[PDB]
Write a protein that binds this ligand. Structure first.
Ligand SMILES: CCc1cccc(CC)c1NC(=O)c1nn(C)c2c1CCc1cnc(Nc3ccc(C(=O)NC4CCN(C)CC4)cc3OC(F)(F)F)nc1-2
Length: 277
């Protein structure tokens, strides 16, 4: 729903608010225009009931996002931010849609498009791994489409919060365990870069086969048991792209030791071999 007279200031710069395009418990996202009618998304986070630990995780993610955006164009831009004791405003790159919503409204995805997105994702995640950050909770919703290019929105660093404001409402894929790796389920560090490869593999599996590998299991304890059980054979239906079949089998090995790495994935023929005549 659009906001028709609202506006906000960030570091002495005024922004017209067109509409709200998202919400967590303590947070909101707004489609906004600056003084020169350039479009942005502003993330607002209320800090009024956040403890020092939570606060410091927000501070950490902001520092890292400000640094890492210079290292890759597959991370979302953070143009400015304002940070007080009460709130954070972040002025960020705008996208017309996130990958989750895009995939919901696409049955048949173009093979070229899928490969292009796969590359974008790999480059983003590779970048955070290179600075010691394992996201540890990658879903399609963490990726924003900006003129055909996927941008990673967050680094999984910040501590999530709950609507004790209430009037409670939430979304399809926030709780989801469909992208979760076996070692995460055992775990309750032992969090390695390989955790992210499983999650990325699950996204690619969605793009290839039209669902995540354990999506069929409604019963959430049966699902978690299926993810861990070596005898539970994951399906990989035959398709023209034999390199894509290989990538998925390699990402979804349950043993993280035996599971493929991001540098390996980047040199894989799926990413590298020119299919075009
Ligand atoms: C809530 C804050 C938060 C906390 C923790 C972690 C995270 C990251 C996941 C975040 N959340 C975030 O950090 C976050 N959440 N959103 C939604 C955005 C961000 C970052 C910047 C950003 C920039 N541009 C956009 N634009 C849009 C992104 C997605 C949609 C969308 O999916 N719409 C659907 C289209 C199809 N129909 C059928 C259903 C709706 C529409 C959008 O803009 C438009 F609305 F203007 F069009 N969004 C975002």
């Amino acid at each position: 729903e659009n906001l028709y007279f609202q506006s906000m200031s960030v570091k002495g710069r005024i922004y017209s608010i067109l509409k709200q395009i998202g919400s967590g418990g303590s947070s909101k996202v707004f489609q906004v225009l600056n003084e020169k009618k350039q479009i942005y998304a502003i993330k607002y986070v209320n800090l009024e009931e956040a403890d020092n630990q939570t606060l410091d995780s927000y501070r950490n993610e902001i520092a890292y996002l400000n640094k890492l955006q210079q290292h890759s164009d597959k991370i979302i831009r953070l143009y400015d931010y304002e940070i007080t004791d009460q709130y954070i405003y972040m002025v960020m790159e705008y996208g017309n849609i996130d990958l989750n919503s895009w995939l919901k409204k696409k049955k048949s995805i173009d093979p070229w498009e899928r490969k292009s997105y796969w590359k974008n994702m790999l480059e983003a995640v590779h970048t955070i791994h290179q600075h010691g950050i394992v996201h540890s909770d990658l879903k399609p919703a963490n990726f924003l489409i900006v003129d055909g290019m996927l941008k990673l929105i967050d680094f999984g660093i910040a501590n999530q919060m709950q609507p004790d404001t209430t009037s409670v409402v939430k979304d399809s894929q926030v709780g989801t365990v469909n992208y979760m790796p076996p070692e995460a389920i055992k775990d309750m560090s032992k969090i390695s870069p390989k955790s992210d490869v499983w999650s990325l593999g699950c996204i690619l599996y969605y793009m290839t086969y039209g669902k995540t590998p354990f999506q069929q299991i409604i019963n959430q304890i049966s699902k978690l048991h299926a993810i861990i059980d070596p005898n539970h054979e994951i399906e990989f239906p035959d398709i023209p792209e034999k390199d894509l079949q290989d990538v998925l089998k390699c990402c979804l090995k349950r043993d993280p030791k035996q599971r493929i790495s991001i540098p390996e994935l980047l040199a894989h023929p799926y990413v590298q071999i020119q299919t075009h005549p």
